[PDB]
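ok here's Paired amphipathic helix protein Sin3b:
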Amino acid sequence: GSSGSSGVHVEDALTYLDQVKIRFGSDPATYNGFLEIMKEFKSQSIDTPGVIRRVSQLFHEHPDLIVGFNAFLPSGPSSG
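and the structure:
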């Protein structure tokens, strides 16, 4: 058929988080860098478009993840 799971409940943040760990299981070095990248944002150091710059480079070998996140993100042009 086709691999795909539609319908994401509100609380859909950690979801993408874990995925990063699973994909980069044998490669902990990659995951680590990601953890730090977040901190920056959690410290009011970078902005939405700022965290993406770091991620991109990190998941450079994974274009599917870099793009997936963008959309995945809850925030957007949607009401609110």
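+1. The two ends are 36 Å apart (CA to CA).
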